[PDB]
Design a protein around this ligand. Structure first.
Ligand SMILES: [Cl-]
Length: 373
């Protein structure tokens, strides 16, 4: 007679508009779980929960797993809305939830004892792109933003304005657009009229790809520099290709070419299991899942509250290098990157699409986050 299985739950947007993200995030968790055929002597099972990229669906599926199967350990979500909602449910039963989403609140006003987050949020993304770019481009004084009229976009814009004030450059204007907007010609001509030195795209996902592609086809790169603050890294770069990307400045959470102990391992793993290089969604869920399983293994405990406490202040090898979970706000302290798209001729392989120009840690003091644990 075998031991009772223990189940780890991946919350992934397997269907709907974010199916591609979910596919690779799921691949990431699966790689982590496969490294533990058993965990503390018990067979380790993985169960995917489809959030459908919808907060309501995420909550109901998590609630069912908690009630019916005694679920406690979760990793994933694509959307901040889903993660905020899920965080409350996991928090109520004293489980553990690690997420890659980017809303600042996850580790701020809405933090809880059960919830941890790997990605750098808007505060750091803005600072690790714009600040090093200002250093690279001392004569770039006039900065124009294009922003989705939505909470994540406004947070980025809020940050871009703080940086402009702090560093003596000029925010010369802004164009808002809806999350559904497919047409950017009008906002691009607004930018042209403003005569910027840098066009800053504060949109994200499919929309930023469409915006950037229109900007480039419009002739923008011949007139001014372009920065996409919040890019999806490799998988987005592959879709756009070097003709679009060449010379464009890009912010990202992860880059497969960075030489670190865990990244070397991860690249070998994805090459041997899927025949590809790791992308951001894959890497974020790989590490988020590995931290949880490693800490269960280290503590000898399946108790959520015990594992969560052990994760506070934990230092470990991660995809960006040596990373630590800050105890006070449950934020992973790690690099965010500024890259620039490469010219086709400088590429060594199909994935050699961008060059890292800067990497660094920008995080607020815990006392400024609103997180009170
Ligand atoms: Cl989601």
């Amino acid at each position: 007679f075998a031991a009772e299985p223990f189940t780890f739950y991946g919350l992934k947007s397997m269907s709907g508009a974010f199916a591609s993200y979910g596919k690779f995030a799921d691949m990431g968790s699966r790689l982590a779980v496969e490294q533990y055929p058993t965990l503390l002597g018990r067979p380790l099972h993985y169960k995917v929960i489809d959030t459908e990229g919808n907060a309501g669906k995420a909550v109901r599926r998590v609630q069912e797993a908690i009630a019916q199967d005694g679920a406690r350990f979760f990793q994933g979500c694509t959307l901040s809305s889903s993660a905020l909602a899920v965080a409350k449910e996991v928090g109520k039963v004293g489980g553990v939830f690690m997420t890659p989403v980017g809303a600042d609140e996850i580790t701020g006003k809405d933090c809880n004892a059960s919830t941890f987050r790997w990605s750098v949020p808007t505060y750091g993304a803005i600072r690790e792109t714009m600040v090093p770019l200002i250093k690279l481009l001392p004569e770039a004084k006039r900065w124009y933003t294009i922003t989705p009229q939505y909470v994540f976009g406004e947070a980025l814009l809020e940050g871009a304005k703080q940086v402009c004030a702090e560093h003596g450059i000029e925010h010369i204007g802004n164009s808002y657009h809806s999350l559904q907007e497919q047409e950017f010609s009008g906002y691009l001509t607004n930018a042209i009229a403003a005569r910027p030195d840098v066009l800053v795209l504060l949109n994200f996902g499919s929309q930023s790809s469409n915006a950037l592609r229109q900007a480039v086809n419009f002739g923008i790169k011949e007139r001014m520099k372009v920065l996409l603050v919040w890019s999806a890294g490799l998988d987005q770069f592959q879709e756009l290709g070097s003709d679009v990307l060449e010379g464009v400045y890009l912010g990202a959470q992860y880059w497969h070419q960075v030489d670190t102990p865990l990244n070397r391992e991860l690249v070998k793993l994805t090459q041997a299991k899927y025949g590809i290089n790791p992308t951001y969604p894959l890497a974020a869920d790989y590490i988020g899942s590995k931290i949880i399983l490693d800490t269960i293994a280290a503590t000898g405990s399946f108790d959520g509250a015990t594992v969560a406490k052990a994760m506070q202040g934990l230092t470990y090898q991660g995809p960006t290098g040596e990373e630590s979970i800050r105890a006070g706000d449950h934020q992973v302290i790690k690099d965010y990157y500024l890259l620039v798209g490469k010219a086709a001729a400088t590429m060594r392989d199909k994935d050699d699409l961008a060059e890292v120009l800067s990497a660094g840690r920008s995080f607020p003091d815990v006392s400024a986050t609103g997180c009170a644990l």
